[PDB]
Amino acid sequence: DGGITQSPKYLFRKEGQNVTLSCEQNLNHDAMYWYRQDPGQGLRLIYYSQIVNDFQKGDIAEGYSVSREKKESFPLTVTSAQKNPTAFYLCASSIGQMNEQYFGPGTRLTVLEDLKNVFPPEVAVFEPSEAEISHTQKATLVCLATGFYPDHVELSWWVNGKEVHSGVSTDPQPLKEQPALNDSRYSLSSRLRVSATFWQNPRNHFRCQVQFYGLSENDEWTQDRAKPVTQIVSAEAWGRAD
Amino acid sequence: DGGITQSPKYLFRKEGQNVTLSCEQNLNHDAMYWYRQDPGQGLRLIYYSQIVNDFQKGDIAEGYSVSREKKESFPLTVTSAQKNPTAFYLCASSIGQMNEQYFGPGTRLTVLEDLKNVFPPEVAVFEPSEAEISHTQKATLVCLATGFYPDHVELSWWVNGKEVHSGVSTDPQPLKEQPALNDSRYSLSSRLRVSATFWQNPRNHFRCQVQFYGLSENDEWTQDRAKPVTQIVSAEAWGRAD
């Protein structure tokens, strides 16, 4: 119903490369902000703008630039000058002064030179065990997303075409398949629990969807394998009558 | 949250085939209903159930069967005996008697024997014209879904990973590519309008997603081409700096 739109949840920034994070809002607010979340002090202001064409620096505006040609947009540019390892950027807007700030979904900008390590995930769904069915009258589908790097994914479940939340339990964070190594790829899993009777209808459909935030179409790909571009990887299953 | 969950928005039913439409609710209601919408009298009651194991027929309960083993579910079965061309089925629940009915999203059950005509859609996205950009400072992406049958689709737009609504204009209904013929396949289009500055950021991503409701994994496929199973077909584009 009209909120804030910013850059995708995850982005790649090659060292010494200039990247711009969009941020637009249709709330007709005048005040727009850009924050960076640093492990210690949490959220910290980068740039702030009270009206068109104006911007007041924050304590960490070093290496960043913004513009405010229009009331709706406040694009933040992270220049090669910036030297942060990887951060989380958050955009916001408010009526102005000190009324009330509304926040965007945030964006994690991961900085890395090497690009040969990037891999989209492989996804699978495993049907519930008859044992589970005939003992709790519930059915639990399991989704496994594996072999991806970096950990730039978002998992969701779709039942009969619509996204669902109740009965969904997803790991809080992707885990390294080999914590030992460093060039380790990641895995992530989730469970969807539904009634047994629902799972037993052959017409019901279940889909596990994993959004991978990879390379852009502009990025150059040297390797031979398809470029790990942003994409959707899914796995599905139909209901099975015992 | 909490509501009603029924069968998918669209379903196929081969003539002389038995199909069951699920309907479950976690509102702990006791009264559950099943309606059929016929072009003349609008919504009409098929079956009704006041408590577990009980069901009172409606004026058109001919050809249908229901069960009420549990309080949460009221599955409607459309038997081969049923001879309706194609209808819209709607599930509902209420505290009971005549308190207040809550409705499911409904399901259109399309009846057809020519399963040789079922085809998923092909999807494309067309970039905005520079003319449009440098004249209105707006950018309009266009999505075209073509060659599908039957008209069992749902289209949505995804910007930077999240589904969007503002700036979206989709045709009210899919249209036959050849109204003349009968075995005509369908097409559907939609537009997404965004600011020009937003479209000019190479890091922004735009995806057109079309959910096709096709055959189940259980359904037998005689043809040679891949079976037109339920699936997601997408087309995407990245922002382009003029």
Curated annotation (Swiss-Prot), chains A, B:
<keyword id="KW-1279">T cell receptor</keyword>
<keyword id="KW-1003">Cell membrane</keyword>
<protein>
    <recommendedName>
        <fullName>T cell receptor beta constant 1</fullName>
    </recommendedName>
</protein>
<feature type="disulfide bond">
    <location>
        <begin position="143"/>
        <end position="208"/>
    </location>
</feature>
<dbReference type="GO" id="GO:0016020">
    <property type="term" value="C:membrane"/>
</dbReference>
<feature type="glycosylation site" description="N-linked (GlcNAc...) asparagine">
    <location>
        <position position="182"/>
    </location>
</feature>
<keyword id="KW-0675">Receptor</keyword>
<keyword id="KW-0325">Glycoprotein</keyword>
<feature type="domain" description="Ig-like C1-type">
    <location>
        <begin position="121"/>
        <end position="230"/>
    </location>
</feature>
<dbReference type="GO" id="GO:0050852">
    <property type="term" value="P:T cell receptor signaling pathway"/>
</dbReference>
<keyword id="KW-1064">Adaptive immunity</keyword>
<dbReference type="GO" id="GO:0046631">
    <property type="term" value="P:alpha-beta T cell activation"/>
</dbReference>
<keyword id="KW-1133">Transmembrane helix</keyword>
<keyword id="KW-0472">Membrane</keyword>
<keyword id="KW-1015">Disulfide bond</keyword>
<comment type="subunit">
    <text>Alpha-beta TR is a heterodimer composed of an alpha and beta chain; disulfide-linked. The alpha-beta TR is associated with the transmembrane signaling CD3 coreceptor proteins to form the TR-CD3 (TcR or TCR). The assembly of alpha-beta TR heterodimers with CD3 occurs in the endoplasmic reticulum where a single alpha-beta TR heterodimer associates with one CD3D-CD3E heterodimer, one CD3G-CD3E heterodimer and one CD247 homodimer forming a stable octameric structure. CD3D-CD3E and CD3G-CD3E heterodimers preferentially associate with TR alpha and TR beta chains, respectively.</text>
</comment>
<keyword id="KW-0391">Immunity</keyword>
<dbReference type="GO" id="GO:0006955">
    <property type="term" value="P:immune response"/>
</dbReference>
<comment type="function">
    <text>Constant region of T cell receptor (TR) beta chain. Alpha-beta T cell receptors are antigen specific receptors which are essential to the immune response and are present on the cell surface of T lymphocytes. Recognize peptide-major histocompatibility (MH) (pMH) complexes that are displayed by antigen presenting cells (APC), a prerequisite for efficient T cell adaptive immunity against pathogens.</text>
</comment>
<dbReference type="GO" id="GO:0002250">
    <property type="term" value="P:adaptive immune response"/>
</dbReference>
<keyword id="KW-0812">Transmembrane</keyword>
<dbReference type="GO" id="GO:0005886">
    <property type="term" value="C:plasma membrane"/>
</dbReference>
<dbReference type="GO" id="GO:0042105">
    <property type="term" value="C:alpha-beta T cell receptor complex"/>
</dbReference>
<keyword id="KW-0393">Immunoglobulin domain</keyword>
